[PDB]
Design a binder for this molecule. Structure first.
Ligand SMILES: Nc1nc2c(ncn2[C@@H]2O[C@H](COP(=O)(O)O)[C@@H](O)[C@H]2O)c(=O)[nH]1
Ligand SMILES: Nc1nc2c(ncn2[C@@H]2O[C@H](COP(=O)(O)O)[C@@H](O)[C@H]2O)c(=O)[nH]1
Ligand SMILES: Nc1nc2c(ncn2[C@@H]2O[C@H](COP(=O)(O)O)[C@@H](O)[C@H]2O)c(=O)[nH]1
Ligand SMILES: Nc1nc2c(ncn2[C@@H]2O[C@H](COP(=O)(O)O)[C@@H](O)[C@H]2O)c(=O)[nH]1
Ligand SMILES: Nc1nc2c(ncn2[C@@H]2O[C@H](COP(=O)(O)O)[C@@H](O)[C@H]2O)c(=O)[nH]1
Ligand SMILES: Nc1nc2c(ncn2[C@@H]2O[C@H](COP(=O)(O)O)[C@@H](O)[C@H]2O)c(=O)[nH]1
Ligand SMILES: [Mg+2]
Ligand SMILES: [Mg+2]
Lengths: 149, 149, 149, 149, 149, 149
């Protein structure tokens, strides 16, 4: 009854040195780290990640902002795809609810700290793009009996 | 002009070792600790606590999950019965607002960390069930002039 | 593309010793401290600060509550006037959204920790009232490239 | 291989509203809450608590400062009697090591936030003074396999 | 029985946006903010501040690093001159004790976040240099009875 | 003038869900994340990691405790090998200084949350064991001018 979502800390999260705070927010709910890797995003991989936006006039500047260190992550939990989006908040930080990552940390959409999958189909596509199968780890949280009903 | 409400940290709050964090959230608003007791909740007392659910099909499992260590608490403040419910958030953590206890810590309704009274009537009944009158402590917060208008 | 707002920690924020926590919430979004000054507010400056309420029955007691230590602040950021208001929350803490300053720290409107300008015109007026131009400091945040689009 | 120690938050800890923060420090090490009770300490019980200081010139003032709300606590862990003393720090906050409770929160010995048992013998005596045996709760922490070797 | 010390957040503390965290550490002990002002340090004022080091070969680069925004502060407390130095930790962060500001935040002496007076004579000299008399505020903390013995 | 050290969060750090808190402690000093990978440690790689203990009676049980999820990390900074060891604290949590990871989170050596390289030679060896060169990411922190001399 759990699912997995792809979450990626963008270069502003790395450079503002809030990686640990971001991870703690997801651990706090008992979400399980199933995969985690630091890499440097490149244009070719970002073009695939943002394939839906191919040709749009904002894409080159988006790719420029995203070319940098990122933390690739997979978290597992109940309804975690939708819940992670809720926790990140609106794309535009000024519209995001107090208590969300983007409202608490950010000002503008082009520097909004973190990416998360928007659907089950996107999560599968994004996890496959950024991770190899060996990098997804299967284990059980010891506090499961107190996290899940 | 203040009220008192009954708040109970459920066994998942004890076992996940977030008792202090929960207490701090209520202290942060200048709510006063009027009573506090660790006990182990048993089926007979839980039957009385959940008396409104007598006969319902979910009550046996509810009593099972709640059989365990709990922290019984009474907090005092302006409108604290309704306000503590707002702070806990929706019964379902997935529906609760970011910034609430259940949204920040939990995933499912059956493991949602904390109980709080839903009304003046329930608060009076619940305080009387879990505490003797001699366990309720009266004192004044030194910062009262800066908390209350 | 940034603006500046006037934020003032009221005597209750000073006395409850949460100045640092308040400042940290604005720093966390990459808002820039452009001015900061501890002073003891006088009725004379408070009458002008609250000029919009001249002749109202609540004004004498309001000035009385505010005659004490305050931290005058100017913060700079994108949309910071409206955003700081959002972060403070509703005037009445009980109506404010979880995750806002007033909801997280306070109980009643008369002791709601902080003031922030309510509009661009009010911000200009309030900054000029509490600060001389030579007290407003211009510098660039080193993380600007990761905060702004 | 575990021990139990008596820890008491003194009236300054209650009044400064740092109870949760104190509890969190002990929970953070995987120490188990075995008992917890808010009460108001009275001279007669404090006379027994401080029996070793019978007849000393400072005892009357010590009893006066301690007359007030307190949080009685029992924590269980490996070597927890000595370890809780290390965590509290020196009696004089000005001599206590950074990172200890008294160094982080306090200024003077007479307002040093917290009491903890100084030995196995004192722990047994103090637990018996402030708690009846039926108030001491036995349960196992779900994360025991990752806390204890 | 209290004294006052001059503490100054250096430009790295401003630019790393840890001002609020620094202030919170001193508020946590019940130290009173007696003065606070943001300014931009200039070579002429820094030459007076660092007058003891006139002519030394490191001074020009020190002044270069310190030319930037700073937060001037006066904190009041028992033994606060010595205690603030202890809380900052060793000049060289690698030698500073865990739990001190410099150990927790910094790497090298040339970027060690904060300055504090080394003596009563230095505190008077530094407070006079960076503050006007009007900027030092006299008021009493409401929690005094629980901070001071 | 910086170096790199190998830091590994052990299965207890994963299961107690304090990964974010651990990372934040190193980020707080301006240490740079150069590599990061979640994996499940195998006896084969653990035998090599712990090669210095081949033939000792504790090694089988050590490998057993460590066969589980781990977060492999490389952090970069001035003197970071020795400094990270200082931040971890003594092997035995009860001997570790307050404010260190082991003293703040742990009770016993066999469950002490984290591993760090003990020397420059061990760091080079351990980085090479757990990471391929292509996994080590080179980038500059935008705050470098405020972190380094
Ligand atoms: N599965 C499950 N559902 C619950 C539990 N507690 C409440 N619910 C359900 O959650 C819904 C939302 O709760 P409400 O927001 O109405 O208090 C209710 O209609 C109830 O059926 C629980 O412990 N487990
Ligand atoms: N349907 C359903 N409702 C529940 C369950 N547990 C609790 N509830 C509802 O949620 C309310 C809040 O639960 P409490 O926090 O008091 O345990 C209860 O008073 C009851 O109305 C459950 O297992 N199933
Ligand atoms: N009715 C009423 N409104 C107030 C009072 N204090 C503040 N307000 C309202 O809230 C706004 C915020 O002003 P602040 O007091 O936060 O600087 C005021 O401009 C006014 O509209 C009060 O005592 N009574
Ligand atoms: N003024 C004052 N001194 C105290 C208090 N408690 C302990 N002391 C003193 O502080 C010294 C240091 O305490 P120790 O570190 O020996 O436990 C003792 O010799 C004792 O005289 C207190 O509440 N007030
Ligand atoms: N001289 C002195 N010692 C004190 C005073 N209060 C406490 N102490 C000492 O400090 C120890 C720890 O104090 P507690 O935390 O138990 O109140 C006491 O057992 C006693 O030895 C005081 O007012 N004066
Ligand atoms: N005697 C003993 N020493 C150990 C044990 N585990 C770790 N150590 C020591 O502590 C060091 C840290 O290794 P770690 O286990 O933290 O990766 C080891 O290289 C070894 O010196 C153990 O089970 N027994
Ligand atoms: Mg306002
Ligand atoms: Mg090690």
């Amino acid at each position: 009854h759990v699912e997995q979502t792809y979450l990626m800390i963008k270069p502003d999260g790395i450079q503002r040195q809030v990686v640990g705070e971001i991870i703690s927010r997801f651990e706090k709910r008992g979400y399980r780290i199933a995969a985690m890797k630091l890499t440097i995003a490149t244009p070719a991989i970002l073009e695939e990640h943002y394939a839906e936006h191919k040709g749009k006039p904002f894409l080159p500047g988006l790719i420029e902002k995203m070319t940098g260190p990122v933390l690739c992550m997979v978290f597992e939990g109940v309804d975690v795809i939708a819940q992670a989006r809720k926790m990140m908040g609106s794309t535009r930080p000024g519209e995001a609810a107090p208590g969300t990552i983007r409202a608490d940390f950010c000002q503008q959409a082009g520097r909004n700290l973190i990416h998360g999958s928007d659907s089950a189909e996107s999560a599968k596509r994004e996890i496959s793009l950024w991770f190899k199968p060996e990098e997804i780890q299967s284990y059980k949280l010891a506090l499961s009996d107190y996290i899940f009903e």
